[PDB]
Design a protein around this ligand. Structure first.
Ligand code: NCD
Ligand code: NCD
Ligand code: ZN
Ligand code: ZN
Ligand code: ZN
Ligand code: ZN
Ligand code: ZN
Ligand code: ZN
Lengths: 363, 363
């Protein structure tokens, strides 16, 4: 007996096109998404060229329309030069991404004043998300309050961060957050197995206490999102390993395993992979779209999943229970038991759908 | 013709006793204060042992009462273990000091949650000051708002920081700040002369643009305070130079030079070295206390000032105009033209004076 889920949404993926297509491209990354039960993805802007201006966004839109197999929206990235210049294209993006700490990214800002300038100039009704670790979470929350608007915190990984966000929510501040599966299912305990190259990720893997705190504070977590961050094994194991884990193909099975163990409910999962992503980012429904999962199937994660060009996974060897059997996207069979059945280009930019525009007051 | 000033107050000094008395002690550091026209100092807690508990405070109080030549108050320091334990002695301290960044200090905290715990437990009517650089300023401001109280930012050094504080004040937030003379009168341009050891300080010396921004935003600066941070020349020039500059003997002459050039007024100076320190820290008046300065005397700062045991200065070679001629402290001549005339032990703990307690609602 299969369970029918709505089309799941991952608001944090790196699809590497343009410019990093040996790691992933729209076609391979959206194949990975579909195999993971994900029918809509929001792609981050730290590509080459980075998506920090109208011409880069135009290029990325065309590459995505030609290559994506599932539906998508594309983030714009904040830079040290583009505040006040994105107004005409802002509404066509998923939102604006701020990179506020060292990581795989034309996009660290030099000064909190630059953060302020982005919060002041980006349209107030459109999403802002931030890579903001440890005290940076508190700092960007302060900027959001000074500018009287909301912010969404990406990949929360630490007890410190989730408790800060919890305190902010208790004060009624408009903040939401997401958590990635590696910060729920891996910890320092796994670094010996992974090694120092494979284990590189930002935010870094946390202690057992960090992981426990995220689970204990599940009520504070608005979304799950993979931070799918593919790099090749050669890159991960080489002399300057880039941070990041692939995760689209493993996220849902890991979380289904947790559901079957009673660690969270099916509803908790659907709030975090469907309803809350929709409402935070004003993402539209997908007609005739659903995912069928088998909750009984036990398997062990292999050394690589079938679709991502990363061709490795940090979850190798973990025992999971639950698998994606079928995905239907807008009335077409998109995935069945290991086979993707929609071509590159089937996917569409949801921000171009009438129902996918973010509502705003007449300007 | 001399000008009579009130007794000036420096709310940020490191007097190194207990435990670092080769660098400075209460007797030498307060001699330096008097020679700089300062009659009251607030001493930081990063000593050895650090002033982070009642027994350490009791020791420091006695050492100060025996050694100080001018009046004083002693800060307590926040640690990772003492939140919720300082309530009985809190009112006897200048305030609570938080070290939130790497510097010469049992006292960096590991987590913003620890900052929150201090803001929640330290009595709400008593001062909190923070070493908080760059985004850390925004982060600690957020914690202050979450806990509904004020904060004072130590040694603001950058355009980024002063503009953030300016924005916070424009939103009516209860934040005050101080600036140290090296961040007004030295910059990157001086690093070649100073060298990499002598030039080490936290916050580091800023660009010309940082310095210009502090001057342009003088209205945002509530206090001047030296961050007198004496270390010996051997230490500054050795293989692991500690950060910090001595500054008590040079602060007032540097600022008087600026007054005579019309860069700020005498009133601006007195707000920042007398009235605002009094009101932010609830420091009492000193009866029969004043400083006489000669605004016409031109001199060049030598390679060391007479009193600080640091026996070096980063301001060597700077031309100044203005000198302290006489200091009277509580009816006794304390300093005349290079000679200190009150003994170690003349100084008193102002928090023990009836008028020096911080007012509070009956608990
Ligand atoms: N998380 C990572 O370790 N890397 C991400 C960047 C990011 O999400 O910060 C990537 O794009 O590779
Ligand atoms: N400012 C410094 O560079 N050093 C100070 C510590 C401090 O004020 O942060 C010291 O105590 O030496
Ligand atoms: Zn990130
Ligand atoms: Zn994110
Ligand atoms: Zn990312
Ligand atoms: Zn400091
Ligand atoms: Zn200070
Ligand atoms: Zn200091």
């Amino acid at each position: 007996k299969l369970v029918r889920l709505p089309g799941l949404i991952d608001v944090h993926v790196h699809l590497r096109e343009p410019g990093g297509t040996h790691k992933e491209d729209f076609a391979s990354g959206t194949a990975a998404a579909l195999a993971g039960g994900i029918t809509m993805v929001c792609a981050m802007p730290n590509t080459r060229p980075p998506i920090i201006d109208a011409p880069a966004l135009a290029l990325a839109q065309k590459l995505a329309e030609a290559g994506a197999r599932c539906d998508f929206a594309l983030f714009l990235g904040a830079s040290s030069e583009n505040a006040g210049t994105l107004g005409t294209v802002a509404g066509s993006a998923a939102g604006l991404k701020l990179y506020l700490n060292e990581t795989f990214s034309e996009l660290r800002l030099d000064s909190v004043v630059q953060w302020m300038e982005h919060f002041e100039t980006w349209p107030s009704h459109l999403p802002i998300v931030a890579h903001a670790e440890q005290q940076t979470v508190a700092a960007v929350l302060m900027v959001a309050q000074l500018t009287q608007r909301s912010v969404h915190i990406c990949h929360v990984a630490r007890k410190e961060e989730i408790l800060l966000i919890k305190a902010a929510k208790a004060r009624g501040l408009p903040v939401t957050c997401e958590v990635a599966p590696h910060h729920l299912f891996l910890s320092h305990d796994d670094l010996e197995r992974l090694g120092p190259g494979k284990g590189e990720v930002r935010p870094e893997l946390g202690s057992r206490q960090d992981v426990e705190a995220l689970w204990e504070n599940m009520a504070v977590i608005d979304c799950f999102a993979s931070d799918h961050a593919p790099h090749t094994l050669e890159e991960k194991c080489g002399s300057r390993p880039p941070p990041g884990f692939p995760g689209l193909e493993t996220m849902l099975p890991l979380l289904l395993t947790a559901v079957s163990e009673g660690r969270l409910s099916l509803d908790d999962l659907l709030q975090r992979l469907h309803h809350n992503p929709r409402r935070i980012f004003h993402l539209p429904p997908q007609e005739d779209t659903y995912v069928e999962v088998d909750l009984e199937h036990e398997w062990t994660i292999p050394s690589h999943m079938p679709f991502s060009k990363a061709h490795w996974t940090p979850f190798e060897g973990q025992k999971v229970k639950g698998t994606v059997r079928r995905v239907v996207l807008r009335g077409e069979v998109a995935y069945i038991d290991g086979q993707v059945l929609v071509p590159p280009g089937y996917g569409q930019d949801v921000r171009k759908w009438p129902q996918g525009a973010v509502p705003q007051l007449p300007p």
